[model samples]
Target: VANEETDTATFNDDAPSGATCRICRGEATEDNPLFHPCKCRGSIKYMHESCLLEWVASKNIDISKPGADVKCDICHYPIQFKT
Candidate 1:
């Protein structure tokens, strides 16, 4: 009795559409699309770049220092930027 692994390989893309940004509680638009930059998933996965940067800035993360890693408090994974 050892055969019950969950489906970890579903092809469906992450649910980026129709999700709300937890930071601002706002809907995503072309002018302000949402981003999933951290390992944290579920409802908290969605956030705005501006809001996130502002939050990070409040903590004095020094993101422009080259190869610095800012991590999520819950998931403990470093937040990555697309650029």
Candidate 2:
């Protein structure tokens, strides 16, 4: 099913009320883009893309590999990439 709620949601400077970045636990804004790439719901659905990748890298995960995939810690679903 098409997720209209997220499909229409564009990255913006303002974090929707009650939403927080799962990575930094900071409010998501244009400066800190809210990336929902997994099936996680509610607050667990939002994360800073950069922070998420950074965490992956910290774990020695090679993110530069073609078709590289990252799994959501909460849901264990594959996180989608921007490109």
Candidate 3:
């Protein structure tokens, strides 16, 4: 059997045409994850990499191997990696 790995998908919120950042409540700029990822369906409720890392570190999770099954601290979604 053959299987492929997939990354996290952008999440959007339903709001006005020119809304704002879904997370930090700031301007959704290129540096912001919610803005450019047009893959974002509607509003941008995204996560900052730093925030994600902090949350993960607190958990002290051990995957045994790199690129394993882990929940993406950003979106609280399942983010699996390859070994």
Tens digits of per-residue lDDT for model 2, 1-83: 65443422323345466456665565666776667778767666777777777867775666668765656677788767666
lDDT of 3 at 78: 57
Better of 2 and 3 by lDDT: 2
lDDT of 1 by residue, 1-83 (tens): 34764322211246744776657656677987787788678777777778788877776688888766776788877876666
Off by over 4 Å in 2: 1-18
Candidate RMSDs in Å, in order, are 11.6, 11.3, 14.0
Q: How would you encode candidate 3's per-residue C-alpha lDDT over 16-79 as one tens digit per residue? A: 4444443344433466333322233345444444443454456676645565555644356553
- Residue pairs in candidate 3 whose N, alpha carbon or C atoms collide under 3 angstroms: 13-43
Ranked by TM-score, the better of candidates 1 and 2 is: 1
* Count of backbone collisions in candidate 3: 1
